[PDB]
Amino acid sequence: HHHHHHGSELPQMVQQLNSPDQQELQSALRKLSQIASGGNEQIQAVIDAGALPALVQLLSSPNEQILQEALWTLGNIASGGNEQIQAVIDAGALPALVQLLSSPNEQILQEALWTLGNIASGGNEQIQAVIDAGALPALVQLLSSPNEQILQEALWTLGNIASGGNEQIQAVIDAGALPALVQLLSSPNEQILQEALWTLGNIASGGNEQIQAVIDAGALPALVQLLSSPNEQILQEALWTLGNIASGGNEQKQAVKEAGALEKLEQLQSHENEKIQKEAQEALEKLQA
Ligand SMILES: [Ca+2]
Ligand SMILES: [Ca+2]
Ligand SMILES: [Ca+2]
Ligand SMILES: [Ca+2]
């Protein structure tokens, strides 16, 4: 695409977000979307022309075509810099997004989850905003969803929250994530297993309190069993997750040994796949530190 020195064209587009001509409205919405799918400089032009408050307000539209595109514009803006994410938060996006997590329209629901995930990919300030807006309860509930597509989205958003500081991880734990995540570890669906492990491993990246909650919820037997998975990605993920657990205190280390991990970690050091050899030796190092 093409360079454009954004002048009064943008502000006029933002104003047409109010147009009673839904054709003119949609047209402007699409152009704002396209611009926000560019780099940070383009994203910044959209923010600086005042688009955010009107986009956020469109999240209460009863017109799904408008709503879905505004959500998409917001999600793109939130895929930029932390200060861009923070502009979306300041404009009031979070409560409207959290509301949408109860939508029975799976397209809107996915898009809200996606937008939330992008906001939660920012710094700990952005993550804390998501927690404070009350997103956790809905996210945790979606862990029991029979909808694999919604489930993966929810898992990615929770995983993002769980990659923050220890208190942010602890909020995820306090909202009850762990039992549903532990149960996912018995899924026959390896794609789900991979996604659940990404999220659980982040939780296990916390401090000893957070690690002990993982052990308390029953994670270890399921993890240890996945060290025999024939899928090598899963095998990698479970090593990574166990290593994180292993890096805690003596109490945490002892739990890992009691669950039988030590012997498995040792054999996997010789695995054919180098990525596994490396994850295994690094998990063993953590345990044995
Ligand atoms: Ca409608
Ligand atoms: Ca539906
Ligand atoms: Ca299904
Ligand atoms: Ca399977």
Author numbering: 4 to 292
Quote the authors verbatim.
In order to develop such a system, three crystal structures of designed armadillo-repeat proteins with third-generation N-caps (YIII-type), four or five internal repeats (M-type) and second-generation C-caps (AII-type) were determined at 1.8 Å (His-YIIIM4AII), 2.0 Å (His-YIIIM5AII) and 1.95 Å (YIIIM5AII) resolution and compared with those of variants with third-generation C-caps. All constructs are full consensus designs in which the internal repeats have exactly the same sequence, and hence identical conformations of the internal repeats are expected.
In both cases the asymmetric units contain tetramers with 222 point symmetry and very similar topologies. In contrast to this, the crystallographic tetramer of His-YIIIM5AII is less symmetric. Here, chains A/B and C/D are pairwise identical (r.m.s.d. of 0.05 Å), whereas an r.m.s.d. of 0.85 Å for the comparison between pairs (e.g. chain A with D) suggests substantial differences. These differences are caused by different contacts within the tetramer. The structures of His-YIIIM4AII and YIIIM5AII represent extreme cases that are most different. In His-YIIIM5AII these differences are combined into a single structure. His-YIIIM5AII chains A/B and C/D represent the conformations seen in His-YIIIM4AII (all chains) and YIIIM5AII (all chains), respectively.
